[PDB]
Symmetry: C2
Subunit: 163 residues, 2 copies
């Protein structure tokens, strides 16, 4: 009753649906066979082979609960762009002299939409963006004069129309 | 009785001092409450409370302040001397860790900026995400993002690399 009879296995395939299917299968097996969280944690290494086994050897001390073991599998194997990479790319290029504010804001908010969904509110997102705006706009627009991207775009478009 | 600030003894000239701003806001909130002035009327009468730079400032922003609450938030935002968050982020991302900057002084310079943002805005995981891309390849070869959870972990692992090299 520790997964020694379980026919599900995971080798480290970096495929979201494969990871969710595996996690779903072992949660079901655990529930149907009446395995405790503590025993599921002590037996989970029986379900890994290849790269997943080498991986588990490296992280198992971090998994103090069954729930943390499941979170480690999702975090490590479900593929995503690392947040640190998104921030670096966000700060890599300032707004050009001839790039209008709408397309500049679209591209930047597109990078912000790659970060975890609940992490930043619109105020924080505006703070991240505001320093990259062209000096042409910041001469007219105080950070304290805008609360939303829509406020910023409304003032920026007026500036563009008056050139 | 009063419907305006004509009997208020408090005024603000634009001193960029957090304690002065909070004292002024507290004093006009007390007067407003004692005289039973509504939010809407306090906003219509607020210009009497400003002189000098604060008067010129208010002339320039008053259209943005559609409520008393928004007026008070604009005073706090404009007169509390702080580096604005957007400038903190730009300065943070301006310099990568050089080949000769060790982990202690790199982390200290970056924490000096992060400590100027609102205390509850970013948890340590988010602060490490902001930092990690700026770390020199000397550290990133040996230190995986998934392997550090705290600045203490990062400092401990970076010092081992330095002790070896
Ligand atoms: Cl079993
Ligand atoms: Cl006062
Ligand atoms: Cl501060
Ligand atoms: Na302005
Ligand atoms: Na407003």
């Amino acid at each position: 009753g520790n997964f020694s009879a379980c026919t599900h296995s995971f080798g480290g395939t970096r495929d979201h649906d494969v990871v969710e299917e595996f996690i779903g299968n072992i949660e079901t097996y655990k529930d149907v066979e009446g395995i405790s969280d503590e025993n599921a944690l002590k037996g989970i290494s029986l379900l890994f082979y290849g790269m997943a086994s080498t991986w588990w050897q490296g992280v198992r001390k971090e998994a103090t609960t069954w729930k943390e073991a499941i979170a480690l599998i999702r975090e490590h194997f479900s593929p995503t762009k690392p947040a640190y990479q998104i921030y670096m790319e966000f700060f890599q290029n300032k707004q050009d002299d001839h790039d209008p504010i709408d397309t500049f804001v679209i591209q930047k908010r597109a990078l912000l939409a790659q970060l975890p969904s609940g992490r930043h509110d619109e105020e924080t997102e505006l703070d991240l963006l505001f320093g990259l705006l062209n000096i042409k706009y910041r001469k007219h627009i105080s950070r304290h004069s805008v609360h939303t991207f829509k406020d910023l775009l409304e003032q920026g478009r007026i500036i563009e129309h008056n050139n």
